[PDB]
Design a protein around this motif. Structure first.
Motif, PDB file in Angstrom:
ATOM      1  N   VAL A  60      20.468 -11.139  -5.495  1.00  0.00           N
ATOM      2  CA  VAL A  60      19.896 -10.239  -4.503  1.00  0.00           C
ATOM      3  C   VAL A  60      18.935  -9.290  -5.239  1.00  0.00           C
ATOM      4  O   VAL A  60      19.237  -8.832  -6.361  1.00  0.00           O
ATOM      5  CB  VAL A  60      20.962  -9.495  -3.684  1.00  0.00           C
ATOM      6  N   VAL A  61      17.817  -9.014  -4.597  1.00  0.00           N
ATOM      7  CA  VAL A  61      16.806  -8.125  -5.153  1.00  0.00           C
ATOM      8  C   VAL A  61      16.215  -7.232  -4.044  1.00  0.00           C
ATOM      9  O   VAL A  61      16.283  -7.496  -2.851  1.00  0.00           O
ATOM     10  CB  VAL A  61      15.618  -8.873  -5.829  1.00  0.00           C
ATOM     11  N   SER A  62      15.600  -6.210  -4.579  1.00  0.00           N
ATOM     12  CA  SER A  62      14.840  -5.183  -3.855  1.00  0.00           C
ATOM     13  C   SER A  62      13.438  -5.348  -4.481  1.00  0.00           C
ATOM     14  O   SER A  62      13.355  -5.707  -5.673  1.00  0.00           O
ATOM     15  CB  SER A  62      15.404  -3.802  -3.973  1.00  0.00           C
ATOM     16  N   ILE A  63      12.415  -5.162  -3.678  1.00  0.00           N
ATOM     17  CA  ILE A  63      11.030  -5.305  -4.130  1.00  0.00           C
ATOM     18  C   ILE A  63      10.282  -3.990  -3.918  1.00  0.00           C
ATOM     19  O   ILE A  63      10.048  -3.507  -2.799  1.00  0.00           O
ATOM     20  CB  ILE A  63      10.331  -6.542  -3.469  1.00  0.00           C
ATOM     21  N   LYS A  64       9.906  -3.439  -5.057  1.00  0.00           N
ATOM     22  CA  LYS A  64       9.193  -2.180  -5.118  1.00  0.00           C
ATOM     23  C   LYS A  64       7.749  -2.289  -5.585  1.00  0.00           C
ATOM     24  O   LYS A  64       7.460  -2.947  -6.584  1.00  0.00           O
ATOM     25  CB  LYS A  64       9.927  -1.243  -6.103  1.00  0.00           C
ATOM     26  N   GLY A  65       6.897  -1.611  -4.848  1.00  0.00           N
ATOM     27  CA  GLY A  65       5.448  -1.524  -5.198  1.00  0.00           C
ATOM     28  C   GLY A  65       5.415  -0.324  -6.196  1.00  0.00           C
ATOM     29  O   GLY A  65       5.697   0.813  -5.783  1.00  0.00           O
ATOM     30  N   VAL A  66       5.150  -0.642  -7.434  1.00  0.00           N
ATOM     31  CA  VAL A  66       5.109   0.285  -8.551  1.00  0.00           C
ATOM     32  C   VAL A  66       4.302   1.548  -8.290  1.00  0.00           C
ATOM     33  O   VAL A  66       4.740   2.684  -8.562  1.00  0.00           O
ATOM     34  CB  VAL A  66       4.586  -0.456  -9.818  1.00  0.00           C
ATOM     35  N   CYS A  67       3.117   1.303  -7.795  1.00  0.00           N
ATOM     36  CA  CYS A  67       2.056   2.253  -7.482  1.00  0.00           C
ATOM     37  C   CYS A  67       2.290   2.942  -6.163  1.00  0.00           C
ATOM     38  O   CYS A  67       2.174   4.171  -6.051  1.00  0.00           O
ATOM     39  CB  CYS A  67       0.731   1.497  -7.570  1.00  0.00           C
ATOM     40  N   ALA A  68       2.661   2.171  -5.160  1.00  0.00           N
ATOM     41  CA  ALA A  68       2.940   2.726  -3.828  1.00  0.00           C
ATOM     42  C   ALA A  68       4.222   3.544  -3.840  1.00  0.00           C
ATOM     43  O   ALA A  68       4.384   4.466  -3.021  1.00  0.00           O
ATOM     44  CB  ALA A  68       3.049   1.574  -2.834  1.00  0.00           C
ATOM     45  N   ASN A  69       5.132   3.160  -4.713  1.00  0.00           N
ATOM     46  CA  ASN A  69       6.449   3.812  -4.865  1.00  0.00           C
ATOM     47  C   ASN A  69       7.260   3.622  -3.582  1.00  0.00           C
ATOM     48  O   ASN A  69       7.896   4.557  -3.075  1.00  0.00           O
ATOM     49  CB  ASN A  69       6.257   5.280  -5.269  1.00  0.00           C
ATOM     50  N   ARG A  70       7.227   2.412  -3.063  1.00  0.00           N
ATOM     51  CA  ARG A  70       7.936   2.064  -1.822  1.00  0.00           C
ATOM     52  C   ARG A  70       8.560   0.686  -1.898  1.00  0.00           C
ATOM     53  O   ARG A  70       8.113  -0.189  -2.655  1.00  0.00           O
ATOM     54  CB  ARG A  70       6.994   2.159  -0.612  1.00  0.00           C
ATOM     55  N   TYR A  71       9.585   0.504  -1.079  1.00  0.00           N
ATOM     56  CA  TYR A  71      10.354  -0.734  -1.025  1.00  0.00           C
ATOM     57  C   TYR A  71      10.069  -1.583   0.187  1.00  0.00           C
ATOM     58  O   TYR A  71      10.066  -1.091   1.321  1.00  0.00           O
ATOM     59  CB  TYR A  71      11.885  -0.398  -1.029  1.00  0.00           C
ATOM     60  N   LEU A  72       9.895  -2.864  -0.107  1.00  0.00           N
ATOM     61  CA  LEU A  72       9.671  -3.858   0.945  1.00  0.00           C
ATOM     62  C   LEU A  72      10.938  -3.918   1.827  1.00  0.00           C
ATOM     63  O   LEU A  72      12.072  -4.011   1.338  1.00  0.00           O
ATOM     64  CB  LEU A  72       9.360  -5.201   0.274  1.00  0.00           C
ATOM     65  N   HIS A  83       0.840  -1.214   0.000  1.00  0.00           N
ATOM     66  CA  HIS A  83       0.000   0.000   0.000  1.00  0.00           C
ATOM     67  C   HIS A  83       0.873   1.261   0.000  1.00  0.00           C
ATOM     68  O   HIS A  83       2.002   1.274   0.491  1.00  0.00           O
ATOM     69  CB  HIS A  83      -0.974   0.056   1.185  1.00  0.00           C
ATOM     70  N   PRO A  84       0.302   2.332  -0.533  1.00  0.00           N
ATOM     71  CA  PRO A  84       0.969   3.636  -0.625  1.00  0.00           C
ATOM     72  C   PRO A  84       1.359   4.161   0.757  1.00  0.00           C
ATOM     73  O   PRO A  84       2.216   5.038   0.928  1.00  0.00           O
ATOM     74  CB  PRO A  84       0.009   4.526  -1.367  1.00  0.00           C
ATOM     75  N   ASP A  85       0.760   3.608   1.741  1.00  0.00           N
ATOM     76  CA  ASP A  85       0.747   3.695   3.156  1.00  0.00           C
ATOM     77  C   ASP A  85       2.015   3.212   3.887  1.00  0.00           C
ATOM     78  O   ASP A  85       2.389   3.691   4.963  1.00  0.00           O
ATOM     79  CB  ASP A  85      -0.376   2.620   3.593  1.00  0.00           C
ATOM     80  N   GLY A  86       2.574   2.165   3.310  1.00  0.00           N
ATOM     81  CA  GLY A  86       3.741   1.463   3.814  1.00  0.00           C
ATOM     82  C   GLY A  86       3.301   0.082   4.345  1.00  0.00           C
ATOM     83  O   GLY A  86       4.131  -0.760   4.685  1.00  0.00           O
ATOM     84  N   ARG A  87       1.999  -0.119   4.387  1.00  0.00           N
ATOM     85  CA  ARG A  87       1.399  -1.375   4.844  1.00  0.00           C
ATOM     86  C   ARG A  87       1.578  -2.473   3.796  1.00  0.00           C
ATOM     87  O   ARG A  87       1.448  -2.270   2.577  1.00  0.00           O
ATOM     88  CB  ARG A  87      -0.072  -1.213   5.208  1.00  0.00           C
ATOM     89  N   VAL A  88       1.841  -3.662   4.336  1.00  0.00           N
ATOM     90  CA  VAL A  88       2.032  -4.883   3.571  1.00  0.00           C
ATOM     91  C   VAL A  88       1.019  -5.945   3.997  1.00  0.00           C
ATOM     92  O   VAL A  88       0.833  -6.191   5.188  1.00  0.00           O
ATOM     93  CB  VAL A  88       3.492  -5.401   3.696  1.00  0.00           C
ATOM     94  N   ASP A  89       0.417  -6.550   2.983  1.00  0.00           N
ATOM     95  CA  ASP A  89      -0.564  -7.635   3.167  1.00  0.00           C
ATOM     96  C   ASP A  89      -0.658  -8.418   1.850  1.00  0.00           C
ATOM     97  O   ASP A  89       0.181  -8.235   0.939  1.00  0.00           O
ATOM     98  CB  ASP A  89      -1.895  -7.119   3.688  1.00  0.00           C
ATOM     99  N   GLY A  90      -1.689  -9.248   1.773  1.00  0.00           N
ATOM    100  CA  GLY A  90      -1.938 -10.054   0.575  1.00  0.00           C
ATOM    101  C   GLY A  90      -3.376  -9.909   0.102  1.00  0.00           C
ATOM    102  O   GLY A  90      -4.308  -9.669   0.896  1.00  0.00           O
TER     103      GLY A  90
END
Length: 128
Positions: free
Chosen positions: A44-56, A17-24
């Motif tokens: 090694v990878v980084s995981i980005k939420g395209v829409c949220a514009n944030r990294y896991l 979420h754009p929020d910083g929240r993670v769920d399924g």
């Protein structure tokens, strides 16, 4: 380019979420399930939420959240297991994996381990 991470444990897609929240979520239509998996170092990878514009990110207490910027907590060892499912293991908290419960909520890193269905993911193309 953009992928969706399908979890074997209930069939939930990892959502950021754009929020910083993670769920399924099980809905293919969700705009927040489109992820950008970037290679840093070999395997090694980084995981980005395209829409949220944030990294896991994984915290030292096992929490899963999404960060506006990249830190040492946003790097994961991406492995193709024997069963052809991928696992994502924290580079900093080396024993913990990204995981989802059969409920749709993430599983605390400190409770994960090999053999669990919760840590198994299938990266899919984002063409709904």
């Amino acid at each position: 380019d953009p992928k969706r991470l399908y979890c074997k444990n209930g069939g939930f897609f990892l959502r950021i979420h754009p929020d910083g929240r993670v769920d399924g979520v099980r809905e293919k239509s969700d705009p927040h399930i489109k992820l950008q998996l970037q290679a840093e170092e070999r395997g090694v990878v980084s995981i980005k939420g395209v829409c949220a514009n944030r990294y896991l990110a994984m915290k030292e207490d096992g929490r899963l959240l999404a960060s506006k910027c990249v830190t040492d907590e946003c790097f994961f060892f991406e492995r193709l297991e024997s069963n052809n499912y991928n696992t994502y293991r924290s580079r900093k908290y080396t024993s913990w994996y990204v995981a989802l419960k059969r409920t749709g909520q993430y599983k605390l890193g400190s409770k994960t381990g090999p053999g669990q269905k919760a840590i198994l993911f299938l990266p899919m193309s984002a063409k709904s």
